[PDB]
Amino acid sequence: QGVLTTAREKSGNFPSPLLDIKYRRRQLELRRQQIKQWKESEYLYLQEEVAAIKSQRSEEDGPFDETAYLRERTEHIEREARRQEAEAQTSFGNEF
């Protein structure tokens, strides 16, 4: 009877909130909001750091393709946001 332990569980008097799909619902879109606000907070931070290395750049240093550097950097904030989504989606729907 090894396989019996796939039903190993010690629940108290009250079921874990997580068994309730709504609780996970809340927490999920909670982090989804919490995520959308970071997404911008990071956009801001990139704006600053953009002209923040324009002021430090010497003339012997390579010309920074603002279009290039700001492209990869925005796309990244996108991915990184998307990632963060699925990941909170993971900890609340898949692997909770």
């Binding site: 009877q1 019996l4 332990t5 569980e9 010690k10």
Partner: peptide, 29 residues
């Protein structure tokens, strides 16, 4: 675990062995 306990030990995800009076690790009753 003594045989009588087995099903319980297998299902209590926190059941853990305690030191005993001879020095042997057992699940407790």
């Amino acid at each position: 675990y003594e045989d009588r306990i087995q099903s319980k030990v297998f299902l209590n995800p926190q059941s853990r062995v305690t030191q005993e009076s001879n020095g042997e690790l057992k699940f407790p009753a």
